[PDB]
Amino acid sequence: VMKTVLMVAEKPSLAQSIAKILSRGSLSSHKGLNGACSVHEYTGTFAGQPVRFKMTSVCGHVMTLDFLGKYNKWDKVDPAELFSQAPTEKKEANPKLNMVKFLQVEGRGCDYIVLWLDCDKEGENICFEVLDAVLPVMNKAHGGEKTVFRARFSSITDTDICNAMACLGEPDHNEALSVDARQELDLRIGCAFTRFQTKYFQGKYGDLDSSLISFGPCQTPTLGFCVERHDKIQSFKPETYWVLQAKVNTDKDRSLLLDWDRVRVFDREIAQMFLNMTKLEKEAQVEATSRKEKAKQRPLALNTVEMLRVASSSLGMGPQHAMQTAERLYTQGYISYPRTETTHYPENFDLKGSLRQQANHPYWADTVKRLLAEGINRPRKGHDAGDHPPITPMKSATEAELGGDAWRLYEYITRHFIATVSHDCKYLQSTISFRIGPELFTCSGKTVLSPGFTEVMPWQSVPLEESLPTCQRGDAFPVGEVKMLEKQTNPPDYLTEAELITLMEKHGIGTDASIPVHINNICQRNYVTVESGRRLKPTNLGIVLVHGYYKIDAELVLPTIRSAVEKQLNLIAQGKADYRQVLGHTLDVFKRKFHYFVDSIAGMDELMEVSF
Amino acid sequence: MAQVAGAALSQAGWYLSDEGIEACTSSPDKVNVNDIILIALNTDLRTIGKKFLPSDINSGKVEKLEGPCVLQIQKIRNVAAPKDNEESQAAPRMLRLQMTDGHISCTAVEFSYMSKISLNTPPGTKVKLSGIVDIKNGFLLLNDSNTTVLGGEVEHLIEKW
DNA sequence: GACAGAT
Ligand SMILES: [Mn+2]
């Protein structure tokens, strides 16, 4: 008799959290027919009536676009037909998880529906996918009453969730259409270009046979970054600048290496005259002294981008490997959601308690016990993007419990968490300025007064240096030796994975869960080879492709078209442009660009002939 | 104007040839030393100058310049920065000016921060070297106490990248 | 017989 309301969310953890918050701890949980999705049940009030609440979760996207059948043959059609005359349907993504069947079975008898998907464009698209899957199996509407509801929330807190249940709205078909247009555009461009390129180059060069040459709005600019770095390395002319350093004996057996204030000189004669002014000078002269007390800022809350960067730089793991390890840890319940851009802790986060769990590990037992005794430091204010809270440890772990690779990622995460809550590193910077003839020199050193977050993060520590001698203005110190050094300008090195992730984030290429895939994709297609130090060296295939694109159409590699097209698609979200016209207009623009690429493909051949 | 004009130019520090002063002048019926100066600042020194800088000044055997003289910049380069990154601030700015009186060429170096002369100072500008200027290893040493930028507007042709 | 990007 009591009406049942379905409460679909986007991930099992979020579904469980919201169910726990709303049910005040009276859940009844059981697994559905996927294993990866659970159904929680409780009882409550909706629209002033007693109803039953069925909380369920999808495991991400439910659908993905694909051509019907003929345009999946790669030989019966030519790619030019994939822009306007290729109908696209929506099939089920992750068929291993029977998402559509599970949703229909759960909705076998529901009356209302409240859709707790995350507040973003992809969330709205998945919202409408779930609605299309669940609506045809519901219990219909008795009269003019509403049936579909939407809940908007910014953070997973009791008050926020209760308020979101208090005020309900409707889904945004405009954002859904924007995401659908983006997906269709990406499919129709990537598939057409890939099938032209890989079917052209497999018929002319035998070395490239049985190899896939792919084009895309993201991986092509990602490769273009590395190829640009390679071009900059190749077009480098070293120089021969001279420096001038002098050693001064402060004590009988103490020698100080001074640094020239004029850092470099690129003229040999000028360097020689400056040395000539300072040869027969055996008495230095002190002029200035500084005792400034600076500080080193503690790190912000852990971001997915920063985690990938550190895993690539220090730990020595690839982006996809790090993401898989983080996902395993999150599933096992050791770290929180590893795909967030929030670097600011929630106002109700229980920092003092999460820190008390890491109070028995011998690696940092002393630091945490001292910190909790003398009080914690408020974490730095940062950016709150409305996504999940930053990656923080949620359960105690030991190297025996975890493996040899999941422990290293866990160890960095928990050491980062303590650093964000610890104090700042305060150090004393001392500089002494010397007059050797008509010239000036400086010697600088650092002394740590009170170490802070460096205790739990030893790699970001002020290096140990000998204290500079105490002296005041007017003291005379014997001069040891003055010499020049014939230095050379160092060419830049190949782009690293850490540097590449920053570049993609600036230009909006790839989301949190797409950045690891794009780096691995260009590596699996032999565009770039991963070298020692996580340096991405372009291959002869990658160089030919990017250089060929600049000759024909620059708008296929430039790291600006992705943001430019995304701005156009936001017009559909705000209602300023209809979904049909924008999609058709952009497709014709690229379709014209496709024809120029095909007609001018002879340009890339003249570069590919040298390599293969 | 014969002796009085020659003395006026000599005191002002402009050392110009007799042909140069008789040609660069305008309105022969009536002119004044200020008019000669105004019209001279806009003329290339290579066509009107006179030989004052001692010969072989770039040999290191001369360690002093006496009297005020006006010279013309040919090119300016920042010796503390690489050729590609000419605007780099990783090192303090040091300028190597090449200077001409019309016939002989000399090289001067910014020995202390000169705010007036910058990397965008056009070729042909005039600088007066007042006082005693010291030459070490054939390089003049410039400061703010011995250089005055008098301007100048001669055909630039500096163009760009 | 392969494709795009995204959760
Ligand atoms: Mn999201």
CSV table of C-alpha atoms (C1' of nucleotides) in Angstrom, one decimal, chain A residues 10 66 195 214 511 514 562, chain C:
chain,number,residue,atom,x,y,z
A,10,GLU,CA,26.0,7.9,-9.0
A,66,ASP,CA,28.0,4.1,-31.2
A,195,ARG,CA,39.8,5.5,-39.9
A,214,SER,CA,44.5,7.7,-33.8
A,511,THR,CA,39.1,15.7,-16.6
A,514,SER,CA,40.7,11.2,-18.2
A,562,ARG,CA,39.2,22.2,-26.9
C,1,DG,C1',39.4,-5.9,-36.9
C,2,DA,C1',40.7,-2.0,-34.9
C,3,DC,C1',37.9,4.0,-33.4
C,4,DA,C1',36.6,9.3,-29.9
C,5,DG,C1',36.2,11.0,-24.6
C,6,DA,C1',34.2,10.3,-20.1
C,7,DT,C1',32.5,8.3,-15.3
